[PDB]
Design an enzyme around this catalytic site. Structure first.
Site, mmCIF file in Angstrom:
data_model
loop_
_atom_site.group_PDB
_atom_site.id
_atom_site.type_symbol
_atom_site.label_atom_id
_atom_site.label_comp_id
_atom_site.label_asym_id
_atom_site.label_seq_id
_atom_site.Cartn_x
_atom_site.Cartn_y
_atom_site.Cartn_z
ATOM 1 N N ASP A 21 2.407 3.308 2.928
ATOM 2 C CA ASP A 21 1.336 4.252 2.589
ATOM 3 C C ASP A 21 1.842 5.514 1.891
ATOM 4 O O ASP A 21 1.578 5.724 0.708
ATOM 5 C CB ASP A 21 0.529 4.623 3.848
ATOM 6 C CG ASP A 21 -0.862 5.180 3.525
ATOM 7 O OD1 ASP A 21 -1.590 5.532 4.477
ATOM 8 O OD2 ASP A 21 -1.237 5.262 2.337
ATOM 9 N N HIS A 75 -9.849 1.613 0.825
ATOM 10 C CA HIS A 75 -9.469 2.449 1.971
ATOM 11 C C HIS A 75 -10.659 2.428 2.935
ATOM 12 O O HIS A 75 -11.660 3.139 2.757
ATOM 13 C CB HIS A 75 -9.232 3.893 1.541
ATOM 14 C CG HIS A 75 -7.850 4.139 1.027
ATOM 15 N ND1 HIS A 75 -7.384 3.583 -0.146
ATOM 16 C CD2 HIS A 75 -6.818 4.846 1.546
ATOM 17 C CE1 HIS A 75 -6.124 3.937 -0.327
ATOM 18 N NE2 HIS A 75 -5.754 4.702 0.686
ATOM 19 N N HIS A 132 1.219 5.373 -2.138
ATOM 20 C CA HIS A 132 0.645 6.328 -3.079
ATOM 21 C C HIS A 132 1.784 6.943 -3.871
ATOM 22 O O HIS A 132 2.363 7.951 -3.465
ATOM 23 C CB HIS A 132 -0.140 7.416 -2.340
ATOM 24 C CG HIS A 132 -1.381 6.907 -1.680
ATOM 25 N ND1 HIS A 132 -2.641 7.109 -2.205
ATOM 26 C CD2 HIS A 132 -1.554 6.161 -0.563
ATOM 27 C CE1 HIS A 132 -3.534 6.507 -1.441
ATOM 28 N NE2 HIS A 132 -2.899 5.924 -0.440
ATOM 29 N N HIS A 153 0.808 -1.221 0.000
ATOM 30 C CA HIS A 153 0.000 0.000 0.000
ATOM 31 C C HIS A 153 0.839 1.268 0.000
ATOM 32 O O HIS A 153 1.405 1.657 1.023
ATOM 33 C CB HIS A 153 -0.920 -0.012 1.238
ATOM 34 C CG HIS A 153 -1.949 1.080 1.262
ATOM 35 N ND1 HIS A 153 -3.295 0.829 1.441
ATOM 36 C CD2 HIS A 153 -1.828 2.427 1.173
ATOM 37 C CE1 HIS A 153 -3.957 1.973 1.464
ATOM 38 N NE2 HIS A 153 -3.091 2.957 1.303
ATOM 39 N N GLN A 202 -10.495 8.819 -4.600
ATOM 40 C CA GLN A 202 -10.209 9.602 -3.403
ATOM 41 C C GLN A 202 -11.324 10.494 -2.872
ATOM 42 O O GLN A 202 -11.458 10.647 -1.656
ATOM 43 C CB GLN A 202 -8.946 10.446 -3.636
ATOM 44 C CG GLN A 202 -8.663 11.463 -2.531
ATOM 45 C CD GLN A 202 -8.086 10.841 -1.263
ATOM 46 O OE1 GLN A 202 -6.873 10.652 -1.146
ATOM 47 N NE2 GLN A 202 -8.956 10.523 -0.305
ATOM 48 N N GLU A 204 -10.903 4.354 7.587
ATOM 49 C CA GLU A 204 -9.676 5.021 8.028
ATOM 50 C C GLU A 204 -10.136 6.264 8.777
ATOM 51 O O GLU A 204 -10.057 7.383 8.270
ATOM 52 C CB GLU A 204 -8.793 5.437 6.842
ATOM 53 C CG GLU A 204 -7.410 5.903 7.340
ATOM 54 C CD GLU A 204 -6.570 6.599 6.291
ATOM 55 O OE1 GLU A 204 -5.406 6.950 6.618
ATOM 56 O OE2 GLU A 204 -7.063 6.802 5.157
HETATM 57 FE FE LIG Z 1 -3.606 4.977 1.258
#
Ligand SMILES: [Fe+3]
Ligand SMILES: [Fe+3]
Lengths: 423, 423
Positions: B310, B211, B60, B58, B153, B214
């Site tokens: 992450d 996701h 980005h 995971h 997102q 979170e």
């Molecule tokens: Fe993430």
């Protein structure tokens, strides 16, 4: 050939009463102005309390009497209990279920219980326990009216063919439709399972009894759907929410809002003290919550609530003798119903309120009703509860079906003295 | 032209091992009874640990390497990070994304990572970062198998054409379908977004990585829908719930009920220690919760869980060198997996468990598998973790693609002494 019960005390009534019997029914009830003499065909209550039979509104006769087979639950936890039950799978047969169910039913007959509602796990494609229980129901009918709840233990939507099996159980004769929303995989399956449960109850004209929110999760609110659906269908009297232990953890504002609906819906509630105090609060360290539903508040609000034993001598609860006064004793303590009147009125939680929960049509000491009644060797509910008295006589259809000669205790001081634990 | 890895230690195995290579694959693995001599075409692990490559489940890559551009996040908060990112919008181009993604990918190659799953924001009508990442995926293939997650997102239902853009990303080649339920405007949009996500994954035969929850909200339970839908479709292996930090705040009763479903569903879980400890607990004053999902309990229950970095050097996390042993170190501490065995077995959280999360089909030191493996200059997982050792050699397809000559430390006491931090 009993014709009369004499010298009977009745809850909430002053004095002694005579209950006349004819053709297996109560023909009339008359007050006495003094003690009546005994005679042939008269059953003397001896100024003891006479009430309509004790009721077991929630028990699992399919799992009863299996504790320690093949091994004992040593931690006492739910998790280990599940494992211990799994280890006994090879012994779970038609005859095994009937033998164990009958063993507990005999203890119940001995304890003045003439009405029993047993849940039976129908998350089993072979429906082994259900077929056995349907035969037991016919066999025990002379002594106990047994209601069978088709209980989808593994869920309705979360178990293969869960809904089909639940309906098959009803087609085979189960009296009540069960459900267990909080155990479904998701909240959505939980809500949907209740719609399916109500649809089946209306399709077959059966009662409903949901294992509802039996979990210390403040977000488990399936009870509002149970009550709303009952209100919508105008069938509150036929509906019961068992456990609702999550309610012990709700904030007060939501609970107050919810109570309006609970009262309006008219549904019934069953708390299971002995098991709830044992299995709830297991994820708390300290302090530890009690985990019983809001019994005291329900009584104050006129919402019908009653007590069940739930489990007897099994992996989920190793104790018990199927005694309702013992269940009541635990509930009065944990729910803090300890004022004199609260304790005295406690008998309602194991008699009348439970009869309402089972939607019984022939229950109570009243003219015209079947002569089903029991005699406790105590002055009132408080006394019976404090001394945990046995059932002196259990009468059904005007005939004695059980009797207990009380224990006799003597202390040898300067002279022998009988002790009866009364002051 | 490597033919053998010699003197290799393997996790959970006693002694030294020889790994024979042929045609870019592992042909056989044989135990040694002593130390083997080096020779031409033999890569000497020197009694160091040999494991299948580290995995980054995971990250980005579309936002990596942007910290301080044009300004630094001074408060360190999520809110300021969002603002700092917005200030860099003029620099977000095709070439910019490729340059930054490649920079971090080179650090990952240097760190023995041969498998990476990057999320890419697809709440952008121009899909700029996605188009860039698809080219990067092809370019880096000789060194890293890169999976791309189409990450909506701004939400699927809460963003204009969110669903259409998510599907467009899949039609362009994204390997995994993403979602972010807790960010949708309502709980209902959150649940519905998951149904849409699963429908797309089945329509295109792609993996899923959500996701999920979170947020420090004890009511954020989208994970149960992710697991239930996976179970229903029989696709657990292809599904991952990333973060699930809300689980850190759930009551124990609900969590226990949920765990049964999590195990049955077979879905994967990713915890991101470095970022979770930093971004979670920000609304608490004191005490402050850690905010990492229930890693220890998942391991105890046999639920597949692994660790991701992450973010690397960006507004949401300014640190990092894309080092998995560093991620592991943080996770072992925050999750209190500090017993010797728990630490030693820690490598599983950044190797095998992550490979399962990525649904890898060619992973592990086993005959028939591609010769993809790395060598750590340490005796076991505990030692590698304690000393934060670099990757001595990274082998892919039987060829060395990265190597690190270890640092050399000397202290000048009465005589010079080499220090290796071993006792
Ligand atoms: Fe993430
Ligand atoms: Fe029950």
């Amino acid at each position: 050939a009993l014709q009369t019960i004499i010298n009977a005390r009745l809850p909430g009534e002053e004095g002694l009463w005579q209950i006349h019997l004819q053709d297996g029914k109560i023909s009339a009830i008359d007050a006495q102005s003094g003690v009546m003499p005994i005679t042939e065909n008269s059953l003397d209550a001896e100024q003891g309390l006479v009430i309509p039979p004790f009721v077991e509104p929630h028990i699992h006769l399919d799992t009863t009497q299996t504790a320690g087979q093949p091994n004992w639950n040593q931690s006492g936890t739910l998790f280990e209990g599940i494992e211990r039950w799994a280890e006994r799978k090879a012994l779970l047969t038609h005859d095994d279920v009937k033998q164990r169910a009958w063993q507990t039913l005999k203890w119940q007959i001995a304890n003045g219980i003439q009405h029993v509602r047993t849940h039976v796990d129908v998350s089993d494609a072979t429906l082994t326990a259900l077929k056995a229980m349907l035969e037991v129901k016919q066999e025990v009918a002379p002594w106990i009216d047994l209601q069978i709840v088709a209980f989808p233990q593994e869920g309705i939507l979360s178990y293969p063919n869960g809904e089909a099996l639940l309906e098959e159980a009803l087609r085979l004769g189960a009296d009540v439709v069960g459900a267990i929303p909080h155990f479904e995989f998701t909240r959505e399956y939980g809500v949907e399972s209740l719609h399916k449960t109500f649809a089946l109850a209306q399709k077959y004209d059966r009662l409903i009894d949901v294992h509802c929110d039996e979990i210390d999760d403040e977000q488990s609110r399936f009870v509002e759907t149970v009550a709303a659906l009952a209100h919508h269908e105008g069938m509150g009297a036929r509906v019961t929410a068992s456990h609702t232990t999550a309610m012990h953890s709700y904030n007060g504002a939501y609970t107050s809002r919810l109570f309006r609906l609970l009262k309006m819906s008219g549904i019934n509630f069953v708390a299971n003290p002995l098991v709830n105090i044992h299995l709830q609060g297991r994820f708390d360290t300290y302090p530890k919550r009690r985990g019983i539903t809001r019994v005291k508040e329900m009584l104050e609000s006129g919402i019908n609530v009653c007590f069940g034993h739930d489990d007897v001598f099994d992996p989920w609860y190793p104790l018990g003798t199927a005694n309702m006064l013992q269940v009541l004793h635990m509930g009065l303590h944990v729910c803090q119903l300890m004022g004199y009147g609260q304790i005295n009125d406690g008998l309602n939680l194991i008699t009348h309120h439970s009869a309402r929960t089972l939607n019984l049509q022939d229950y109570g000491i009243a003219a015209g009703n079947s002569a089903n009644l029991i005699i406790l060797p105590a002055e009132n509910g408080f006394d019976a509860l404090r001394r945990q008295v046995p059932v002196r006589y259990s009468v059904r259809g005007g005939k004695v079906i059980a009797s207990t000669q009380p224990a006799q205790t003597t202390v040898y001081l300067e002279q022998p003295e009988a002790i009866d634990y009364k002051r």
